[PDB]
Ligand binder design. Sequence first.
Ligand SMILES: NC(=O)[C@H]1CCCN(C(=O)C2(O)CCSCC2)C1
Ligand SMILES: [Zn+2]
Length: 140
Amino acid sequence: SGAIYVGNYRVVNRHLATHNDWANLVWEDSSRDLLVSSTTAQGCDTIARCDCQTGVYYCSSRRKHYPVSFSKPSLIFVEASEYYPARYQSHLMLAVGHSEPGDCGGILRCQHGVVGIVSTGGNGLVGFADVRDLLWLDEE
Ligand SMILES: NC(=O)[C@H]1CCCN(C(=O)C2(O)CCSCC2)C1
Ligand SMILES: [Zn+2]
């Protein structure tokens, strides 16, 4: 579990969104595994606006932050899970690291701020849903 809290937005994995998230919906995209809901309180996270390919992510199944090198956001084939069939997920970045079911929502960050959240795992790989292109998270 986990979310990004920027401005009056809460960014979560679409597959982990709550009823309150759907009842206060701003935007959602199944192909990216992302959903954004509105919040009453202002958040403290800042979004990175950069092309970094190195950063650090939080892994809840290890209680640890790990430095990683990650690929550029791309269209990657993801195997069937309890939440999605086998399909192409867009704006996904891969790295070598631990990610088991429950690690989704952990933040990946670089020197500029939040880059994205854990969205996929298994096989000694971890995939992150990028948020750096969502410029509207910085306004309204
Ligand atoms: N964004 C997605 O399509 C993910 C939905 C949840 C499940 N996804 C995963 O990668 C695993 O849970 C599969 C079992 S091993 C741990 C990682 C894919
Ligand atoms: Zn950066």
